[PDB]
Amino acid sequence: GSVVGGLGGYMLGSAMSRPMIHFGNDWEDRYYRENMYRYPNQVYYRPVDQASNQNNFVHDCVNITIKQHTVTTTTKGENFTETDVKMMERVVEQMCVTQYQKESQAAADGRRSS
Questions:
Q1: DSSP 100
Q2: Does the keyword Acetylation apply (predicted)?
Q3: Element at 99 (helix H, strand E)
Q4: For 1-114, CATH number?
């Protein structure tokens, strides 16, 4: 899975499932579900050595995977709205929270295996 000219060496995760978010609003929970199939399954990441945190890895990951959904995708027939992107800021966070933990464990525990 490519990008607009790579991202400077960024890696790409395995496909993932949809998180159950708990926004609090029934309109969000509905809207989320009404579009849950359109959200990404995979997230880009950087390797865990130089940066390594649950903040910066995960913020940038949202910015990035969203950007691929904004430009690598909206120029091929997609057209996410503000509200769809606002949902995506959560969906990719949850995904890249796990991707961070996976990559960290697979580094620290040595189990380099997605």
A1: H
A2: no
A3: helix 82-108
A4: 1.10.790.10
Distance CA 21, CA 14 (A): 20
* Measured distance CA(31)–CA(48) in Å, rounded: 34
> Among 3, 110, 105, 109, which Cα is nearest to 52's?
105
Give the 3-state secondary structure of 24-82.
CCHHHHHHHHHCCCCCCCCCEECCCCCCCCCCHHHHHHHHHHHHHHHCCCCCCCCCCCH
Q: How was this structure determined?
A: NMR
* Block residue for tokens 């903040």: 55
